[model samples]
Target chain A: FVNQHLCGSHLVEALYLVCGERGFFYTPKA
Target chain B: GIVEQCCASVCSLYQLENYCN
Candidate 1:
Protein backbone atom coordinates (compact mmCIF):
# COMPACT_ATOMS: atom_id res chain seq x y z
CA PHE A 1 0.00 0.00 0.00
CA VAL A 2 0.98 3.64 -0.57
CA ASN A 3 -0.25 7.11 0.10
CA GLN A 4 -1.39 9.00 -2.96
CA HIS A 5 0.78 11.81 -1.66
CA LEU A 6 2.52 12.86 1.52
CA CYS A 7 3.24 16.20 3.09
CA GLY A 8 4.96 18.02 5.93
CA SER A 9 1.50 18.69 7.25
CA HIS A 10 0.81 14.95 7.10
CA LEU A 11 3.80 14.26 9.31
CA VAL A 12 2.85 17.17 11.48
CA GLU A 13 -0.59 15.71 11.99
CA ALA A 14 0.93 12.36 12.87
CA LEU A 15 3.19 14.01 15.42
CA TYR A 16 0.33 15.95 16.87
CA LEU A 17 -1.16 12.61 17.91
CA VAL A 18 1.97 12.00 19.98
CA CYS A 19 2.53 15.57 21.19
CA GLY A 20 -0.34 17.59 22.69
CA GLU A 21 -2.56 20.68 22.63
CA ARG A 22 0.14 23.00 21.31
CA GLY A 23 1.21 22.80 17.69
CA PHE A 24 4.52 21.36 16.39
CA PHE A 25 6.86 21.15 19.35
CA TYR A 26 9.72 23.34 18.04
CA THR A 27 7.88 26.27 16.49
CA PRO A 28 7.54 29.44 18.57
CA LYS A 29 4.16 30.80 19.49
CA ALA A 30 3.03 34.26 18.42
CA GLY B 1 3.15 26.92 -2.10
CA ILE B 2 5.54 25.90 0.63
CA VAL B 3 3.13 23.15 1.63
CA GLU B 4 3.02 21.83 -1.91
CA GLN B 5 6.81 21.86 -2.18
CA CYS B 6 7.00 20.14 1.17
CA CYS B 7 4.79 17.30 -0.06
CA ALA B 8 6.88 16.97 -3.20
CA SER B 9 10.04 16.53 -1.16
CA VAL B 10 8.39 14.04 1.16
CA CYS B 11 6.90 12.02 -1.66
CA SER B 12 10.34 11.73 -3.23
CA LEU B 13 11.91 10.77 0.08
CA TYR B 14 9.34 8.04 0.73
CA GLN B 15 8.32 7.16 -2.82
CA LEU B 16 4.78 7.48 -1.48
CA GLU B 17 3.07 7.25 -4.83
CA ASN B 18 4.32 3.75 -5.66
CA TYR B 19 3.66 0.51 -3.83
CA CYS B 20 1.87 -2.88 -3.85
CA ASN B 21 4.65 -5.04 -5.23
Candidate 2:
Protein backbone atom coordinates (compact mmCIF):
# COMPACT_ATOMS: atom_id res chain seq x y z
CA PHE A 1 0.00 0.00 0.00
CA VAL A 2 2.92 2.34 0.57
CA ASN A 3 4.09 2.16 -3.01
CA GLN A 4 0.55 2.52 -4.29
CA HIS A 5 -0.06 5.63 -2.21
CA LEU A 6 3.30 7.16 -3.05
CA CYS A 7 3.19 6.50 -6.76
CA GLY A 8 -0.53 6.68 -7.44
CA SER A 9 -1.58 9.50 -5.17
CA HIS A 10 1.24 11.82 -4.19
CA LEU A 11 3.29 11.77 -7.41
CA VAL A 12 0.23 11.87 -9.61
CA GLU A 13 -1.15 14.90 -7.84
CA ALA A 14 2.19 16.69 -7.94
CA LEU A 15 2.69 16.04 -11.62
CA TYR A 16 -0.84 17.15 -12.43
CA LEU A 17 -0.32 20.46 -10.62
CA VAL A 18 3.13 21.07 -12.07
CA CYS A 19 2.30 20.43 -15.74
CA GLY A 20 -0.27 23.27 -16.03
CA GLU A 21 -3.22 20.92 -15.95
CA ARG A 22 -4.42 22.81 -12.85
CA GLY A 23 -3.83 26.28 -14.35
CA PHE A 24 -1.06 27.04 -11.85
CA PHE A 25 1.86 27.08 -14.31
CA TYR A 26 3.15 30.65 -14.48
CA THR A 27 6.03 31.14 -16.93
CA PRO A 28 7.38 34.68 -16.68
CA LYS A 29 8.68 34.67 -20.28
CA ALA A 30 5.94 32.58 -21.89
CA GLY B 1 -2.78 57.96 -32.19
CA ILE B 2 -1.76 58.92 -28.67
CA VAL B 3 2.04 59.13 -29.12
CA GLU B 4 2.52 56.32 -31.69
CA GLN B 5 0.62 53.60 -29.79
CA CYS B 6 3.22 50.92 -30.30
CA CYS B 7 3.51 49.34 -26.85
CA ALA B 8 1.55 48.99 -23.66
CA SER B 9 0.59 52.28 -21.98
CA VAL B 10 2.07 51.29 -18.63
CA CYS B 11 5.32 49.97 -20.16
CA SER B 12 6.06 53.06 -22.27
CA LEU B 13 8.60 55.57 -20.92
CA TYR B 14 6.54 58.54 -21.96
CA GLN B 15 3.59 57.35 -19.93
CA LEU B 16 5.64 56.09 -17.00
CA GLU B 17 7.66 59.30 -16.74
CA ASN B 18 4.71 61.62 -16.77
CA TYR B 19 5.01 62.58 -13.09
CA CYS B 20 8.81 62.44 -12.89
CA ASN B 21 11.19 65.39 -13.47
Candidate 3:
Protein backbone atom coordinates (compact mmCIF):
# COMPACT_ATOMS: atom_id res chain seq x y z
CA PHE A 1 0.00 0.00 0.00
CA VAL A 2 0.98 3.62 -0.41
CA ASN A 3 2.04 6.06 2.29
CA GLN A 4 -1.45 7.56 2.30
CA HIS A 5 -2.71 4.26 3.66
CA LEU A 6 -0.28 4.23 6.54
CA CYS A 7 -0.06 5.92 9.88
CA GLY A 8 2.68 8.56 10.21
CA SER A 9 5.08 6.21 12.00
CA HIS A 10 4.17 3.26 9.77
CA LEU A 11 4.80 5.44 6.75
CA VAL A 12 8.33 5.94 7.99
CA GLU A 13 8.66 2.19 8.44
CA ALA A 14 7.36 1.58 4.94
CA LEU A 15 9.89 4.02 3.52
CA TYR A 16 12.65 2.23 5.36
CA LEU A 17 11.43 -1.07 3.97
CA VAL A 18 11.49 0.34 0.43
CA CYS A 19 14.71 2.36 0.83
CA GLY A 20 16.83 0.27 3.21
CA GLU A 21 20.23 1.99 3.76
CA ARG A 22 19.12 4.94 1.62
CA GLY A 23 16.30 5.61 4.05
CA PHE A 24 17.46 9.18 4.55
CA PHE A 25 16.27 10.12 1.08
CA TYR A 26 12.79 11.53 0.47
CA THR A 27 10.71 10.70 -2.60
CA PRO A 28 9.72 14.21 -3.72
CA LYS A 29 13.05 15.94 -4.01
CA ALA A 30 13.21 19.49 -2.68
CA GLY B 1 -18.79 6.79 14.57
CA ILE B 2 -17.39 3.56 15.89
CA VAL B 3 -18.67 1.57 12.97
CA GLU B 4 -17.29 4.06 10.50
CA GLN B 5 -13.93 4.01 12.21
CA CYS B 6 -13.96 0.21 12.20
CA CYS B 7 -14.84 0.23 8.54
CA ALA B 8 -11.83 2.41 7.86
CA SER B 9 -9.65 -0.03 9.74
CA VAL B 10 -11.04 -2.93 7.75
CA CYS B 11 -10.50 -1.05 4.53
CA SER B 12 -6.94 -0.34 5.57
CA LEU B 13 -6.38 -4.04 6.23
CA TYR B 14 -7.87 -4.96 2.88
CA GLN B 15 -5.67 -2.45 1.13
CA LEU B 16 -2.62 -3.73 2.93
CA GLU B 17 -3.39 -7.29 1.99
CA ASN B 18 -3.96 -6.24 -1.58
CA TYR B 19 -0.53 -4.67 -1.62
CA CYS B 20 1.03 -7.72 0.02
CA ASN B 21 -0.35 -9.91 -2.73
Candidate 4:
Protein backbone atom coordinates (compact mmCIF):
# COMPACT_ATOMS: atom_id res chain seq x y z
CA PHE A 1 0.00 0.00 0.00
CA VAL A 2 1.16 3.50 -0.83
CA ASN A 3 0.44 4.87 2.63
CA GLN A 4 1.92 7.97 4.26
CA HIS A 5 4.95 6.26 5.81
CA LEU A 6 5.88 4.46 2.64
CA CYS A 7 5.36 7.57 0.59
CA GLY A 8 7.74 9.54 2.78
CA SER A 9 10.37 6.82 2.63
CA HIS A 10 10.11 6.58 -1.12
CA LEU A 11 10.49 10.31 -1.51
CA VAL A 12 13.41 10.42 0.91
CA GLU A 13 15.10 7.61 -0.96
CA ALA A 14 14.55 9.40 -4.25
CA LEU A 15 16.14 12.51 -2.80
CA TYR A 16 19.09 10.44 -1.64
CA LEU A 17 19.64 9.06 -5.12
CA VAL A 18 19.50 12.44 -6.83
CA CYS A 19 21.82 14.20 -4.35
CA GLY A 20 19.47 17.16 -3.81
CA GLU A 21 17.33 16.86 -6.94
CA ARG A 22 13.61 17.40 -6.45
CA GLY A 23 10.26 16.74 -8.17
CA PHE A 24 10.41 13.01 -8.68
CA PHE A 25 8.66 10.05 -7.12
CA TYR A 26 9.87 6.52 -6.59
CA THR A 27 8.19 3.65 -8.43
CA PRO A 28 7.92 0.07 -7.23
CA LYS A 29 8.92 -2.83 -9.42
CA ALA A 30 6.28 -4.19 -11.75
CA GLY B 1 17.99 17.62 8.24
CA ILE B 2 16.20 20.39 6.34
CA VAL B 3 16.23 18.48 3.09
CA GLU B 4 14.62 15.36 4.58
CA GLN B 5 11.89 17.41 6.17
CA CYS B 6 11.19 19.16 2.90
CA CYS B 7 10.97 15.88 1.05
CA ALA B 8 8.66 14.41 3.69
CA SER B 9 6.40 17.42 3.59
CA VAL B 10 6.18 17.22 -0.18
CA CYS B 11 5.41 13.53 0.06
CA SER B 12 2.56 14.16 2.46
CA LEU B 13 1.15 16.89 0.26
CA TYR B 14 1.35 14.73 -2.82
CA GLN B 15 -0.33 11.82 -1.05
CA LEU B 16 -3.14 14.10 0.08
CA GLU B 17 -3.47 15.74 -3.32
CA ASN B 18 -3.80 12.41 -5.10
CA TYR B 19 -6.44 11.15 -2.70
CA CYS B 20 -9.26 12.87 -4.57
CA ASN B 21 -8.54 11.11 -7.84
- Report the number of the highest-TM-score candidate: 3
Please compute the TM-score of chain B alone for each predicted structure, in the order given.
Answer: 0.25, 0.20, 0.25, 0.26
DockQ of every candidate structure: 0.12, 0.01, 0.05, 0.07
Best by lDDT: 4
Q: Give the range where candidate 1 chain A is weakest over 10 consecutive residues by summed lDDT.
A: A21-30
**List of clashing residue pairs for candidate 1:** none
Docking class of 3: incorrect
- Candidate 2 local Cα displacement, residue B1, angstroms: 57
> Number of clashing pairs, model 3?
0
The CA lDDT of each predicted structure is: 0.39, 0.28, 0.38, 0.41
What is candidate 3's lDDT per residue for B1-21, written digit by digit as tens?
A: 212332344233333332221
Q: lDDT by residue for model 1 over B1-21, one digit each (tens)?
A: 323543564333233212212
Q: For residues A1-30, write the lDDT of model 2, one tens digit per residue.
A: 011112224433433433433332211221
Clashing pairs in 3: none
Q: Mind giving the per-residue lDDT tens digits that candidate 3 earns over A1-30? A: 422344445644554565565434323223
Give the candidate order by descending DockQ. 1, 4, 3, 2
Pull out the clashing pairs in model 2: none
Q: Candidate 4, which segments miss by more than 4 Å at Cα? A: A1-6, A20-30, B1-21
What candidate 2 gets wrong by more than 4 Å, as runs, is: A1-6, A22-30, B1-21
Docking quality class, candidate 2: incorrect
